[PDB]
């Protein structure tokens, strides 16, 4: 009937190993991975890469995901992957007792399955280009502790590929990647992107901690309020909102005597506007601090904070490899900055734009001009050409274009003591000297047609004195996207939220 | 009006007046300004001349032609003395400065004969000049002197209500203990992050706007997300597992979570900062448990060392006394069954053997176990493992040869839960089985389930209450003392 032959070969493909002491292959439960009633010294590819670029003397155990597997008759080639490390492993069954069933079982493993391999490492004449570990494991044993259960939504070979203008080049589009984000995050570049994101949080916090800041956590469930862009929730039959920013609370912390504070936390913004550059939820980096007599003391401090961030991102083996891996798939010129950061007034920036023919305004209607986002990018091109930098500062915005807490110039009330920082022509930071006089604050709140009653907890925090202070807010994802030159904010947010995407 | 003009005197030139309210712009000669933290750290050499120093007027007293000002900044105070010069108009202006005003004082530093017991800067300043850059506009809601005192529960004594403090949090936070508490909160965050980063973790940030609850829809806040039905995250549980499923191997998050518990208790809030860890293990999830244990031991060690942290803990204990937090060199680990049998042996519970795994230990019972283990093991810190499967969430992996027990754990400080975690189910078929066994909607969770379907590493994780860890470390009586602007069902403001 020739059916028994198929059922037997199926038992081979599904083989469960009951004793890794007496067998060389199979699916195995984690609790059975004991060799001689003892525990296995198990390596990952990261350790292997550091030591090699003792475990060359004899057989070792190594764990990883099956990135790729190529069957070639009596040979089979496995690429193992861990993070951004990979290594070719070789099963040569003319070297394993002509166990053809073991080869049948190995060839049948689906991509991404997790295996523990026992084998010998050695260096080959011509190492594989794709693998950054230049040794190979010769497989003595291979057991699968987790088998892929389902066809992948797309192949990693395709998702890892640079921009495709070539014949037969398959792209994986944004919607597909984000709907299958846990597969998309396995590309080398995406892995590197979020290691770099972590790296920015780390450098940010450590710089501020070294300058005597304390970290704060302030609430995101608010009771009142730019109400236009605020998500609403029912807070126990009370009318509540999600924080668009920790603004009010970080200031209240300075009014309490904390002197220097920072927060790393989500904020929530209901901008019904699908763009490549904003999200409805993002991680905000917030700083608030006192100054002595000049708010430029703090500006120059914020500036050296970003020069330190850029310097650390661009220094050392680890950060060098992460950036290179991103650039392999998403090429872009290295981010440039100067020893002295260029600073331009809003008024100077306009005149540069009028002078380069990018902007036309009647000599009356200059103060009221609200520079567009496209125009800010035109300004960046100009400053890149004339100052050879991707990073500069704009100060002294018109008070009418800034929020109500922004201190204006005493002797020129239409100008404010405010500032934006730019990376590749796009805003990464916004801040200002604060109004720290209760009566001025009350006046400016009235002058903005705002309800002082819904702000009195905040207003009242200024009524028992208030140090001179300033602050800024920073988009983490935006800093990472613009440092690397990526085309979309969704590339630097783990599970992006926009007005059409609530899932994953 | 003549005496009023002198009390409201605005100084238009600092070089030649010596007193008055002055704007920040009219303050150049620019001075070299000091704060009391720089003073304190350099003394406990600027003592050779007149220095400028800014601070708040913590206390002021007019001993005839003498004026005593206690200047305050953060945790540091120093006594400053005015004794006219014979410029009586200046003594009038100073004596009327309301408390909490911010002044720039210029003068000389001298060792005092009798060091003031109150000021931890055991020097004094002699005032050559004093200006007020910020004048208290309003009468405080209570006095800092009363806010700083230990609460004597007797008739007619001072007591600043919790409600009064929280309604006026920006004054409340100026007490020496409250400032110290939140410095210690930053310290925990720092020790936690740095320990993980040194162990090769990466920081992740995952969304708090969801289409489905992460810890059960009964206690989740509802949100209108552009005409979708949404919820606030109760924990990053689903996303931190997805990141392990994506290969990140070791992740942590420090981020708010939101829980709509309609109970007003002393130990829980509706918003708190969750410290979350998720990581792979090789063969045995106890590898990660021991690692979590060693993280907390490191935190306790670093919090308890000499220097700044001892000063901070000491400042807190001055107003809120409590014995130092203790832990052993080797942490005690009890199974859930053993913990229950300790409670039975001490007459706190009457349970037959076959009823033990069905008992769900209450908060009071856990405090009772805390007292038992404190008397017998001499520690404030222990671990319980092997909780009943039916009492833990659906992502908890059960013991294969003993399914009614799970591979789960809580950590405790002073008998109260600070951490909860478990080995995760890392098999997509077993996960679907457990989702159904817990009568849950696999369709709502599909994005999460699916992340296990292209292989899943053995992993575990845990979630930690930042505010509760600080509260229990210091022995404080209410979670609202370790959250800056606490949220409970009755308080949305500040
Ligand atoms: N929808 C968004 N999506 C993404 Cl991804 N990033 C966004 C979005 N919106 C903003 N950012 C980023 O956050 C930055 C700060 O925000 S802000 O509005 O300009 N001013 C602050 O709130 C203000 N309180 C700061 C202060 O004065 O201390 C900004 O520079 C961008 O980089
Ligand atoms: N209302 C509250 N207020 C305040 Cl202030 N703190 C609270 C509140 N609720 C809880 N905590 C604290 O957070 C801890 C973890 O929370 S959890 O529910 O037990 N388990 C996790 O969610 C689970 N996904 C973790 C995992 O398996 O990795 C807990 O130990 C407490 O310390």
Numbering used by the authors:
A (entry chain A): 97 to 149, 179 to 350, 353 to 631
B (entry chain B): 103 to 131, 135 to 149, 179 to 218, 222 to 631
Quote the study's own text:
Protein translation relies on aminoacyl-tRNA synthetases (aaRSs) to charge tRNAs with their cognate amino acids. Plasmodium AspRS is a Class IIb aaRS that exhibits unusual sequence features compared with human AspRS, including initiation from an internal methionine, and an insert in the anticodon-binding domain. PvAspRS (96–631) was successfully crystallized as the apo protein, in complex with the natural intermediate, and with synthetic Asp-AMS and Asp-DACM, allowing insights into the binding determinants. As anticipated, PvAspRS adopts a dimeric structure with features typical of Type II aaRSs.
We solved the structure of PvAspRS with bound synthetic Asp-DACM and refined it to 2.4 Å resolution. Well-defined electron density was observed for the adduct in both chains A and B. The Asp-DACM is located in the active site pocket of the catalytic domain and interacts with a number of amino acid residues. The adenine moiety is stacked between H405 and Y409 from motif II. H405 moves from its position in the apo protein to form a parallel π stack with the adenine ring. In both chains, R396 extends to interact with the aspartate of Asp-DACM. Similarly, E398 repositions to form an H-bond with the adenine. The aspartic acid moiety of Asp-DACM also interacts with Q374, R561, and K377. Residue E352 (of the SEGG motif in Chain B) repositions to interact with the amino group of the aspartate, leading to a small movement towards the ligand. In Chain A of Asp-DACM-bound PvAspRS, two additional residues of the flipping loop (G353 and G354) are resolved compared with the apo protein.
